């Protein structure tokens, strides 16, 4: 019993974290096989970040200007290139702790675990979601750039995020491991504003299912609804529209609990219209939207990883 | 910026997790040096749990009845003993991944990270607190027994919890690594009820400090209070009494932000008396009490671990 915001075990990623220093800037890199991935703004000074020309700044950089430290051992850089907003530093030694891994670009509403690091050393692990506005609400201080987000399927790490920037509003933006930003953000100190942070409706429903599985059921009502009618309420509260694809994904949880997806939509409707009247659901006083339907199934069944 | 419920990196503990099977019961054990620690109810059947006599049930067990599997390799058991509510299984091979470690018994209100495991394999990591009633609000399914809670200071893992039981109310109870239960609970399927779950006042204040550090400041008011007057409000809302020791622990956060501890107590008072009027603090609609003052300092400064 019990349902918790739970990250993947981080050991497999911990073994990939290194420190990258260029000039006077130090951040984290990701060492997989004989390549080290890091944000390209490692080459920038604080003054460069206002209007950097990365191609021009890179011309002044040679292999030996990139200092790569794996804990206590120095790695030899034999090649470097820029791919979108990341640098790939080729080193002469394959990481002996490289796990099976893939690079994946996730969609808004998908969740992942972040290993926060400073100077190439792990600091902590927590769970995040890619928001509909393509930000994440993380915990990142100066020097955390290069920290990565990941998912694990049994024995394989799917890397999906690398941290790059913090918006003036306190939220965070980054790239996939090919160096492409999520959303419209750029690696410059510029007037960059996030759009509407809508709520991930399908994740809230999955979390309501998780609550029923664990004894929290006061919110179940006698009503049902339709997609179109529920979506009229969703729009009013800045909830993502619910699609038939979302309903299908919720099918397994609907099957286990015996509560049709649309009946649970009607319970969500009343929670949005009437509030929670000071009550709680799985220890929260608001509706949680950073659990996917796959997250709920995993935690409610005890799935493990190699 | 940003403040998140963050666990310690789990890699060092992942390397200590093994599977222990006795008869038809399988749970997790902790392999440190040449000893494997696991709950003593591994020797019990579901029928034994009603009224077990552990000394009598253990007489029928020999070294070869305890099957210990480290991932894929079988470990040879050369000795076993019972210490309070844990078994110590002596194996013929020291765990080569043993970190520096200590066994610590924590106090109510202290936090720690849990590595949930099934069949000796890590499933996920999340943060917990020892409640004032000596339970924890975890996420544990059948087979998770033997999962451990821990803290890390730089290079040293302090093991503080091993999971044993789930109360009928859905909360959880366990032992330190010497086999002594936290609180009055016992490893029997018995009418066991948790006492009042009071709120850890000092942790709520630390979390209010964390919020101010990150821009959430709407709750700061023009009032102050005294310990005795605040504690009259704390008692009414089932908050732990605040002591001068707690005030001293908050000193560093009071120094950094410039908000005297008692001024922040007056803000907490108004939040308890008037509620939050539908607002949020660090993304929560209730007052979080599972961050210690040391947790806040750590996350707000970027402390790392070897
Ligand atoms: Cl999640
Ligand atoms: Cl914490």
Author numbering:
A (entry chain A), B (entry chain A): 1 to 306
Lines from the paper:
The viral open reading frames are expressed as two overlapping large polyproteins which must be separated into functional subunits for replication and transcription activity. This proteolytic cleavage is primarily accomplished by the main protease (Mpro), also known as 3C-like protease 3CLpro or nsp5. Mpro cleaves the viral polyprotein pp1ab at 11 distinct sites. The active site is located in a cleft between the two N-terminal domains of the three-domain structure of the monomer, whereas the C-terminal helical domain is involved in regulation and dimerization of the enzyme.
Of the 16 active site binders, six covalently bind as thioethers to Cys145, one compound binds covalently as a thiohemiacetal to Cys145, one is zinc-coordinated, and eight bind noncovalently.
